[PDB]
Design a protein around this ligand. Structure first.
Ligand SMILES: Nc1ncnc2c1ncn2[C@@H]1O[C@H](CSCC[C@H](N)C(=O)O)[C@@H](O)[C@H]1O
Ligand SMILES: COCc1ccccc1-c1cc(O)c2[nH]cnc(=O)c2c1
Ligand SMILES: [Cl-]
Ligand SMILES: [K+]
Ligand SMILES: [K+]
Ligand SMILES: [Mg+2]
Length: 213
């Protein structure tokens, strides 16, 4: 079996069905005590929680689902009728994510979109009936953060006040993305210093609020 299957089995055996907080705690335990994994984790997760509660987004797009940790984390804080769309290129991860969601009881709030973000983003309006996004969580691959931000803008998916929250802007690091949003008058940026999931390694999130074209 894979690490991802091991994480899911651990949650199923150590968490309470329908209790998102116990799912997150189980994942964080497994990944602290047994096998590191690239979930956003509790340190950065606490910052995401604070952001989600501040903005109360009706529609969130996540880029990169993996095992569903961040999806669970965000979806548990969404208001009734709010939705999360999560894009995931790896079908094995998608299948783990869907089971993680189902176990947490959040399946009604979250839709997994299977494919590359660069292929799916342009389908959001016509295929998935999206108008504009309230929040985007970028946590996929570092080299996609800037191109996908530009593509979201081109596709008309950002509106004044859309919140972009980017993981791993320090490690692995997203220097082109940071230089771009920080230098652009189309984004108002804040850096949130934290730590790499499960490790004593400085990392951080960037919040970039879209200000219109
Ligand atoms: N271009 C792309 N489109 C969609 N998903 C992608 C992608 N490039 C990488 N991915 C996916 O991005 C994920 C990064 S790890 C995501 C962790 C998750 N956000 C969490 O915090 O719990 C991986 O599962 C990987 O397969
Ligand atoms: C594949 O590298 C794993 C890794 C190794 C060392 C340090 C950081 C990471 C890391 C951490 C993350 O939160 C990540 N989140 C999303 N996509 C990632 O590729 C990613 C990578
Ligand atoms: Cl952590
Ligand atoms: K709202
Ligand atoms: K700026
Ligand atoms: Mg990450």
């Amino acid at each position: 079996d894979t690490k991802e299957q091991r994480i899911l089995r651990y949650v199923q055996q150590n968490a309470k069905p329908g209790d998102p907080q116990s799912v997150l705690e189980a994942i964080d335990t497994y990944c602290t005590q047994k096998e590191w994994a690239m979930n956003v984790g509790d340190a950065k997760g606490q910052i995401m929680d604070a952001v989600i509660r501040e903005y109360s987004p009706s529609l969130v797009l996540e880029l990169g689902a993996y095992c569903g940790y961040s999806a669970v984390r965000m979806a548990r804080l969404l208001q009734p009728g709010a939705r999360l769309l999560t894009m995931e290129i790896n079908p094995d991860c998608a299948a783990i994510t869907q089971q993680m969601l189902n176990f947490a009881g959040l399946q009604d709030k979250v839709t997994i979109l299977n494919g590359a973000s660069q292929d799916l983003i342009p389908q959001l309006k016509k295929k998935y009936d999206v108008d504009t996004l309230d929040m985007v969580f970028l946590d996929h691959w570092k080299d996609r953060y800037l191109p996908d931000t530009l593509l979201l803008e081109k596709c008309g998916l950002l509106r004044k006040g859309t919140v972009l929250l980017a993981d791993n802007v320090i490690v692995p690091g997203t220097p082109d993305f940071l230089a771009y949003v920080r230098g652009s008058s189309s984004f108002e940026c804040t850096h949130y210093s934290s730590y790499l999931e499960y490790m004593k390694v400085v990392d951080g999130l960037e919040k970039a609020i879209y200000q219109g074209p």
